[PDB]
Short mmCIF file of C-alpha atoms and ligand atoms in Angstrom, two decimals:
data_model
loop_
_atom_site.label_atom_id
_atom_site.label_comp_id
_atom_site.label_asym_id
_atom_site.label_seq_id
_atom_site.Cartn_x
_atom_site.Cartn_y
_atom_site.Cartn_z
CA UNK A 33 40.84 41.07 -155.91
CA UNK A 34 42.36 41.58 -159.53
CA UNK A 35 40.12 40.84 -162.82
CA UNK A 36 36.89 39.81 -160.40
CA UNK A 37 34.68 39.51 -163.43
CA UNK A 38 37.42 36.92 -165.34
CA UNK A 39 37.88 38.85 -168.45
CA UNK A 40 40.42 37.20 -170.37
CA UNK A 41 43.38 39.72 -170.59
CA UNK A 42 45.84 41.21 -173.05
CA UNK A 43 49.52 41.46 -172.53
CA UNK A 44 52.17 43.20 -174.39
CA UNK A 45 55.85 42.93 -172.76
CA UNK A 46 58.61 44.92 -173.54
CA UNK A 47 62.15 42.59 -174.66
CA UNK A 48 63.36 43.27 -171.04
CA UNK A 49 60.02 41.43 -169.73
CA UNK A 50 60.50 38.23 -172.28
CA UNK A 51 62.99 37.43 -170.79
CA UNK A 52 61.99 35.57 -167.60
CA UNK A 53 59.10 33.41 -168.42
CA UNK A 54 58.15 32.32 -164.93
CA UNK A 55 58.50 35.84 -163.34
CA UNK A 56 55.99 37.32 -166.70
CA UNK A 57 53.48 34.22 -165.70
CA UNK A 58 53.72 35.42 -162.15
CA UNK A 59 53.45 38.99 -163.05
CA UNK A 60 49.97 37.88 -165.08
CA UNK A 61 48.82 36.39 -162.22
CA UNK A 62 49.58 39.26 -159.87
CA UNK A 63 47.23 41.22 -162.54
CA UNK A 64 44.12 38.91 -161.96
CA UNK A 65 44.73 36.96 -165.32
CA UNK A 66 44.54 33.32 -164.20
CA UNK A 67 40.94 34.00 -163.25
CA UNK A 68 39.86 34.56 -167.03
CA UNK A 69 41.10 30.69 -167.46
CA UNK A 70 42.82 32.46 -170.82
CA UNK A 71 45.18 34.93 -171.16
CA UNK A 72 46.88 36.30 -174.87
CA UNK A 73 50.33 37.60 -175.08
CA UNK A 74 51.64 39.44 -177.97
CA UNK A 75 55.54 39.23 -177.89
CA UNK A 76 57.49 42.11 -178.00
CA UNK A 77 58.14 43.14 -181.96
CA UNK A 78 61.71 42.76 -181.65
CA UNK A 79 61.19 38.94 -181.00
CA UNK A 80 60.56 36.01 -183.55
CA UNK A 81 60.26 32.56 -183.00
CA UNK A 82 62.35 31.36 -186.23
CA UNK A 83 63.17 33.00 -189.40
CA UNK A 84 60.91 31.78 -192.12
CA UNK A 85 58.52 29.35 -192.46
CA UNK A 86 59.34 28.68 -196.42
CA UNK A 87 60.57 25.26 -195.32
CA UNK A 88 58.12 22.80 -193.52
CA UNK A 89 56.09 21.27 -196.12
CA UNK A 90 57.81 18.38 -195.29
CA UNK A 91 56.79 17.57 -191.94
CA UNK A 92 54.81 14.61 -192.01
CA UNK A 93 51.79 14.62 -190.26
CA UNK A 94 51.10 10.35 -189.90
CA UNK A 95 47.89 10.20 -188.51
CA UNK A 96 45.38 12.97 -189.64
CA UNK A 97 42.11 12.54 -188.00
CA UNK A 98 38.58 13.47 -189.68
CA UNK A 99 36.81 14.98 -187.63
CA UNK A 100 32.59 13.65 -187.56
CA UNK A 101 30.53 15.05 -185.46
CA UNK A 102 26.64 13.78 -184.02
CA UNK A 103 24.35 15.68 -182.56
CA UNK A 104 22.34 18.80 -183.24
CA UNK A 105 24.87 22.08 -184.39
CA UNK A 106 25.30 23.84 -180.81
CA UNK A 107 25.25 20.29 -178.65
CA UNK A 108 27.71 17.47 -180.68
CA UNK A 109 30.33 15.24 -179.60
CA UNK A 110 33.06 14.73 -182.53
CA UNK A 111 35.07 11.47 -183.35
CA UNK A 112 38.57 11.16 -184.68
CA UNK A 113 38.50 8.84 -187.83
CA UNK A 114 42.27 8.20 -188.69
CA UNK A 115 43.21 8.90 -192.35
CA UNK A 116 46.21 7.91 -194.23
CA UNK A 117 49.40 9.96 -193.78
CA UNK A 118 50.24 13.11 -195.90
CA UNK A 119 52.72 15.98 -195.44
CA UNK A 120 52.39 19.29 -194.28
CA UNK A 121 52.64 20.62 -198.09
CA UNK A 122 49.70 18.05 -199.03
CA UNK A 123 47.98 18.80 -195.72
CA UNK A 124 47.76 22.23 -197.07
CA UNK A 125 46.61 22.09 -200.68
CA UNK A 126 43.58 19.65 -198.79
CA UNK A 127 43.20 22.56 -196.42
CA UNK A 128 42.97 24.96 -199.52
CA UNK A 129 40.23 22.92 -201.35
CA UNK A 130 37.00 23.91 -202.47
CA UNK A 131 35.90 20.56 -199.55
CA UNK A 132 37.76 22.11 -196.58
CA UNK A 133 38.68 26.03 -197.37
CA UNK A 134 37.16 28.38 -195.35
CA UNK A 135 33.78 30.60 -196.58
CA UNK A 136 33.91 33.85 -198.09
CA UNK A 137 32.94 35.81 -194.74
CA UNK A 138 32.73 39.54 -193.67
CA UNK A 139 34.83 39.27 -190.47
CA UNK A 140 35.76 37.40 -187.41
CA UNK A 141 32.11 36.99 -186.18
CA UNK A 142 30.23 36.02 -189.07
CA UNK A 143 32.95 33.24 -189.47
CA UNK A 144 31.82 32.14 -186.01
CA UNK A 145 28.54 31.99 -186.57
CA UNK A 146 28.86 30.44 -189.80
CA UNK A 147 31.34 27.93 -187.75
CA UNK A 148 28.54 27.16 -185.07
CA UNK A 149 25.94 26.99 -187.88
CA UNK A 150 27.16 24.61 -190.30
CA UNK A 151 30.39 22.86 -188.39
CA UNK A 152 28.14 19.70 -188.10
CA UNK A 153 27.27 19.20 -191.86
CA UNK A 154 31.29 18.78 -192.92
CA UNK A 155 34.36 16.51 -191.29
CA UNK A 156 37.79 18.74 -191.47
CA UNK A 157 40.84 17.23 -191.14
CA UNK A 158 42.94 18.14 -188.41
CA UNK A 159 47.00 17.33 -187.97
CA UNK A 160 47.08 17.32 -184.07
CA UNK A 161 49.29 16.10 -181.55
CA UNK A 162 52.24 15.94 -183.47
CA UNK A 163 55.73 15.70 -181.38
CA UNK A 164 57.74 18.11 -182.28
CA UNK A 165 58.99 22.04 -182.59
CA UNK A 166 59.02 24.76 -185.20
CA UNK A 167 60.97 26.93 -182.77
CA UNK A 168 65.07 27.85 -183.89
CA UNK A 169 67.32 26.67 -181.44
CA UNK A 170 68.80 30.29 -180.95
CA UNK A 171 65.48 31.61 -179.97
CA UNK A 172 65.56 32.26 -176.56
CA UNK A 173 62.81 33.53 -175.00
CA UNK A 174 59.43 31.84 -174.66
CA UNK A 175 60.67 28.81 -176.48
CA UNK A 176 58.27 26.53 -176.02
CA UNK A 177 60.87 23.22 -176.81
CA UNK A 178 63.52 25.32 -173.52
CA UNK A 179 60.78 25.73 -171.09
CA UNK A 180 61.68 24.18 -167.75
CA UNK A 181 59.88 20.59 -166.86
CA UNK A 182 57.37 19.99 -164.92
CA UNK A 183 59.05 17.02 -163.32
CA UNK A 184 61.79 19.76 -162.60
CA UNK A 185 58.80 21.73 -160.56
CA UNK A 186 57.81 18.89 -158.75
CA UNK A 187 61.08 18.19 -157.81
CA UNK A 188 61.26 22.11 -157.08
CA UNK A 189 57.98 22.37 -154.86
CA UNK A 190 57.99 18.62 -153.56
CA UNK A 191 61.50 17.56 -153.46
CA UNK A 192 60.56 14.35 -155.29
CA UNK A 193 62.29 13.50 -158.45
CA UNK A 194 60.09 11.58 -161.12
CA UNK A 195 60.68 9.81 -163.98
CA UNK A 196 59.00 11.75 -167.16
CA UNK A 197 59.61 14.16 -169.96
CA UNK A 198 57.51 16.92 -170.95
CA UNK A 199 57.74 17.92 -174.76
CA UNK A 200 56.13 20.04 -177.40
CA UNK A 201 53.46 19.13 -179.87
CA UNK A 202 52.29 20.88 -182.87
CA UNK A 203 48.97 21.22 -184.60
CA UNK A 204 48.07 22.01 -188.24
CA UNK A 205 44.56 23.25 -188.43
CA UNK A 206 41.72 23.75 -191.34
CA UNK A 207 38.40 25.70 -191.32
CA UNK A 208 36.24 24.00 -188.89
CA UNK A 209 38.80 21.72 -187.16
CA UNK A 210 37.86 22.19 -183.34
CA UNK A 211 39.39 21.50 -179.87
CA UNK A 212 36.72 20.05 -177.50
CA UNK A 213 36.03 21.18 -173.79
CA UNK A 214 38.66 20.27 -171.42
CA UNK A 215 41.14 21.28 -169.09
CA UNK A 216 44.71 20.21 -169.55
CA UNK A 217 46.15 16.85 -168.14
CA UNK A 218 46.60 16.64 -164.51
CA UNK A 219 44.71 20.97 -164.45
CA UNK A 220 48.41 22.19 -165.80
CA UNK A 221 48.62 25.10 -167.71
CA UNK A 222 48.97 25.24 -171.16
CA UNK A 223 50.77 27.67 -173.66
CA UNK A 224 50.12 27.85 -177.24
CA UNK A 225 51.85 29.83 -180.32
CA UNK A 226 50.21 30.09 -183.61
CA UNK A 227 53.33 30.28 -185.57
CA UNK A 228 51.62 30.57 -189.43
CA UNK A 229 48.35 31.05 -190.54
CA UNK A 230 44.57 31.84 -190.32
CA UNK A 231 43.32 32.60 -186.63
CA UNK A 232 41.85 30.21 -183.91
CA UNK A 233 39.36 31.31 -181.87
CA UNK A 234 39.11 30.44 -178.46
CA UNK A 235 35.75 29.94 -175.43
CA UNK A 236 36.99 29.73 -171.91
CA UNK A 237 35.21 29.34 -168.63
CA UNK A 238 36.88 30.72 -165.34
CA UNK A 239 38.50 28.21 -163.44
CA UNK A 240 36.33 29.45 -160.50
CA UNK A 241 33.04 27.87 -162.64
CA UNK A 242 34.36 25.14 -163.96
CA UNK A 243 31.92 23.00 -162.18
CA UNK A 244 29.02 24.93 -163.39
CA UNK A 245 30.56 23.69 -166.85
CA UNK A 246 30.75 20.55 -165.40
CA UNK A 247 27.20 20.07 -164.60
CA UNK A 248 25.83 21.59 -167.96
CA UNK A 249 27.70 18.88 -169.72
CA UNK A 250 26.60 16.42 -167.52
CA UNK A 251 22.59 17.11 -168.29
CA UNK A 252 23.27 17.49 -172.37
CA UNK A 253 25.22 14.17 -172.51
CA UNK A 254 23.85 12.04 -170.37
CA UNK A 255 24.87 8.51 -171.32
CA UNK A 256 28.59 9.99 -171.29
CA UNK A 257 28.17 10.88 -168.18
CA UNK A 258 27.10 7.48 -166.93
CA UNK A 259 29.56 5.90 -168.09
CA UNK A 260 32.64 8.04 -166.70
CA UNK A 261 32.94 10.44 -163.93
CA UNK A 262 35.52 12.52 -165.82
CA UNK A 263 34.23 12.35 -169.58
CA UNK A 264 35.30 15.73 -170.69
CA UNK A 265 38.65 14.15 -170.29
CA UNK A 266 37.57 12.27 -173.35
CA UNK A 267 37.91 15.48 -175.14
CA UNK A 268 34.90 15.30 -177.38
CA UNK A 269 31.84 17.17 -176.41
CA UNK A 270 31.13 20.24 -177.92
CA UNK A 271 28.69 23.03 -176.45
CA UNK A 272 28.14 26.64 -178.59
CA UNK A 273 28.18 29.88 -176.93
CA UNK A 274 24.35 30.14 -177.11
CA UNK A 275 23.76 27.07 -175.37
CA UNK A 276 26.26 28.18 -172.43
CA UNK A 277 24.19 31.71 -172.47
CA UNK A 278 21.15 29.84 -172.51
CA UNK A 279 22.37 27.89 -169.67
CA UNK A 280 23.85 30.83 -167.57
CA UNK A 281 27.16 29.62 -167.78
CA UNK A 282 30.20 32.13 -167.30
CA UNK A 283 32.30 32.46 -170.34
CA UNK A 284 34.45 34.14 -172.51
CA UNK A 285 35.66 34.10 -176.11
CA UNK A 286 39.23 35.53 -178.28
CA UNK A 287 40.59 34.88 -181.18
CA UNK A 288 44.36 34.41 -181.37
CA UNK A 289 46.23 35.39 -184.83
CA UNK A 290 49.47 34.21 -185.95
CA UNK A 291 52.50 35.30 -184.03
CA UNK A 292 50.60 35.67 -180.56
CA UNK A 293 50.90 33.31 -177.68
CA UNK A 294 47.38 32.03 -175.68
CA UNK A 295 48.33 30.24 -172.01
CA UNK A 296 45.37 28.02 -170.23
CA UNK A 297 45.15 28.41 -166.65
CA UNK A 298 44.58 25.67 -164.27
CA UNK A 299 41.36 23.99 -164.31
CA UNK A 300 40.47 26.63 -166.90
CA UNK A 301 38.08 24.65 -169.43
CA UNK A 302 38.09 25.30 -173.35
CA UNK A 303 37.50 25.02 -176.39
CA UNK A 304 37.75 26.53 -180.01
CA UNK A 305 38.41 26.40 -183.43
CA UNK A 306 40.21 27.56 -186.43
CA UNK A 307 39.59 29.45 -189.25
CA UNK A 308 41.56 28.27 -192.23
CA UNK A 309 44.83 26.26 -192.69
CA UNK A 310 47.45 27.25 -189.78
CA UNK A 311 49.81 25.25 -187.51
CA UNK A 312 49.83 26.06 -184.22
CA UNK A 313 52.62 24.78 -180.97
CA UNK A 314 51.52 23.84 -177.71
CA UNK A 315 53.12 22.27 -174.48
CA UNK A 316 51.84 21.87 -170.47
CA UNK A 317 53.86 23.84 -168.29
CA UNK A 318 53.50 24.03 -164.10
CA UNK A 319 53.98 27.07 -161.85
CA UNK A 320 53.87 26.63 -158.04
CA UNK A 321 50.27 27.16 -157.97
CA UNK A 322 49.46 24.35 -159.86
CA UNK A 323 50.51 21.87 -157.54
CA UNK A 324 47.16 22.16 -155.56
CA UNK A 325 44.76 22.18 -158.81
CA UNK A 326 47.31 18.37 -159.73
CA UNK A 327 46.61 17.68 -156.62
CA UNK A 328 42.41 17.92 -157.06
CA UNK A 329 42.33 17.43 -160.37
CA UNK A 330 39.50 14.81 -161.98
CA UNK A 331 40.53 12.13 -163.79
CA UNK A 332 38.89 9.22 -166.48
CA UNK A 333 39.78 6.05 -165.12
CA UNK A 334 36.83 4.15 -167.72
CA UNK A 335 39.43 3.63 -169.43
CA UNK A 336 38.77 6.43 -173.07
CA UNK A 337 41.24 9.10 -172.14
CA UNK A 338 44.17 7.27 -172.34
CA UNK A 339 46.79 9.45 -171.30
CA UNK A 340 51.19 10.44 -171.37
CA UNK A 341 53.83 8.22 -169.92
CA UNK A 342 54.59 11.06 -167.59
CA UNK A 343 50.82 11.83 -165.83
CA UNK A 344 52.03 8.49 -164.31
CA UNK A 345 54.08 10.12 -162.19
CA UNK A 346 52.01 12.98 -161.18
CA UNK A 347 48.71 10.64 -160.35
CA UNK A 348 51.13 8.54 -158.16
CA UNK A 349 52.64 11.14 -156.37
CA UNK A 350 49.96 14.38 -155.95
CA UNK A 351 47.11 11.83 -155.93
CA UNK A 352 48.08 8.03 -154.06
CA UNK A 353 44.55 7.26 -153.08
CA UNK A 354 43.44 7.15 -157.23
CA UNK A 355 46.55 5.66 -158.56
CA UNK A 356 45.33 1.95 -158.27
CA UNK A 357 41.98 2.93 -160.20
CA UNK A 358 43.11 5.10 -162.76
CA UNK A 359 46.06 2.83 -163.54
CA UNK A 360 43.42 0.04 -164.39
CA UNK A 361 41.81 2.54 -166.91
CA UNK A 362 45.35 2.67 -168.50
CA UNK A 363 46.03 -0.62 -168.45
O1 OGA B 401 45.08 24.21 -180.60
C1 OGA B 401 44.36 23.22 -180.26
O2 OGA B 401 43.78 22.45 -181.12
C2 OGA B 401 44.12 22.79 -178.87
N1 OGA B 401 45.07 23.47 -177.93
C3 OGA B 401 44.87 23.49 -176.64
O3 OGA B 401 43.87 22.93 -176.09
C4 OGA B 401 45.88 24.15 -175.77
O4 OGA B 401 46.84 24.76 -176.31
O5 OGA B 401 45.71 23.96 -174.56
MG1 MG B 402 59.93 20.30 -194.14
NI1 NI B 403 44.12 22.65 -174.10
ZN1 ZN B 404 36.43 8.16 -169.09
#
């Protein structure tokens, strides 16, 4: 068995091997990567994903959210307060402000334990979930806005053809602004470039433990967990890296810098956060592997996660016997 302990891996391809982005993801898995949950590729240096960045200021992110957090500093859930929209140039001199800019710090790992220190004393603003690209048309490989679909997989594996479209979203970050524990939608995988800016560090727990996650979370949020089956589809709950030692839980941790690609695995659960102002691209992508994990895959029906036109689809095809339920929670 490749990669038995789950270390998250490190791949460099050449320009010949960026060019097939299924084959590369099938080559990563033939390597034991998948069973990290994480894996962080560093494109060739011939490749670029546009040519400058000099002109995106004015991108308008419409709905920042403020992100508050409750709890004690290594056990918190976080709520989105909306905020009035500002553009990505505005967005930035906010992210450069004494409030929100990152601490004078000696390295990578005093900044996280400054970040799992203090992160519930202050409520960053974060610009997620915004549709769109920052990818040039003529880039062609690992173009995250020309991947295939993953109605086009379904189609490929299952013969079905679905109604849906699968596009990308990007994600401008400040100190402190943090991704809660999840898996994707539907446990697809996930691929994410940090085209500009300061890093994003990343916690991941192999897919094969994800239960042991599971139950953790279950014991340190109790009333969440009465109330849905699924809550860590509500994408709130934070848990530090001390509390999962403290808890035995099997994990493992990366930060990603601008210009490198991360990809999620099925069912692999994480979570992170970034360092300073960046902007970061992300879309859900299948392989024929997935199909079982969409197939098993939890899902909220009390009715917080609130999900994509297109996990319509995939609930009423890979999983009949829910689709009744969890269409109640979306409607
Ligand atoms: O970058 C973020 O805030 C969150 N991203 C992801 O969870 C991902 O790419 O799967
Ligand atoms: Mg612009
Ligand atoms: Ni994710
Ligand atoms: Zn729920």
């Amino acid at each position: 068995a490749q990669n038995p302990n789950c270390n998250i891996m490190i791949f460099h391809p050449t320009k010949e091997e960026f060019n097939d982005f299924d084959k590369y993801i099938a080559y990563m898995e033939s390597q034991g990567a998948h069973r990290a949950g994480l894996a962080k590729i560093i494109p060739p240096k011939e490749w670029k994903a546009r040519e400058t960045y000099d002109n995106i200021s004015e991108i308008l992110i419409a709905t920042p959210l403020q992100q508050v957090a409750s709890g004690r500093a290594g056990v918190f859930t976080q709520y989105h307060k909306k905020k009035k929209a500002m553009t990505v140039g505005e967005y930035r001199h906010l992210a450069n402000s004494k409030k929100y800019q990152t601490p004078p710090h000696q390295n990578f790992e005093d900044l996280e334990r400054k970040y799992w220190k203090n992160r519930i004393y202050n409520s960053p603003i974060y610009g997620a979930d915004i549709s769109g690209s920052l990818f040039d048309e003529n880039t062609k490989q690992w173009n995250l806005g020309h991947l295939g679909t993953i109605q086009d997989l379904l189609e490929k594996e299952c013969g079905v053809v679905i109604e849906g479209v699968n596009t990308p979203y990007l994600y401008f970050g400040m100190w402190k602004t943090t991704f809660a524990w999840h898996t994707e939608d539907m446990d697809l995988y996930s691929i994410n470039y940090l085209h500009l800016g300061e890093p994003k560090t990343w916690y991941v727990v192999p897919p094969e433990h994800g239960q042991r996650l599971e139950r953790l979370a279950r014991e340190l949020f109790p009333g969440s967990s009465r109330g849905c089956g699924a809550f860590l589809r509500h994408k709130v709950a934070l848990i530090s890296p001390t509390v999962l030692k403290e808890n035995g839980i099997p994990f493992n941790r990366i930060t990603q810098e601008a210009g490198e690609f991360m990809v999620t695995f099925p069912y692999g659960y994480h979570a992170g956060f970034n360092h300073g102002f960046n902007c970061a691209e992300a879309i859900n992508f299948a392989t024929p592997r997935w199909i079982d994990y969409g197939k098993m895959a939890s899902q909220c029906s009390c009715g917080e996660a609130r999900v994509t036109f297109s996990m319509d689809a995939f609930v009423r095809i890979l999983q009949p016997e829910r689709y009744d339920l969890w269409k109640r929670g979306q409607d």
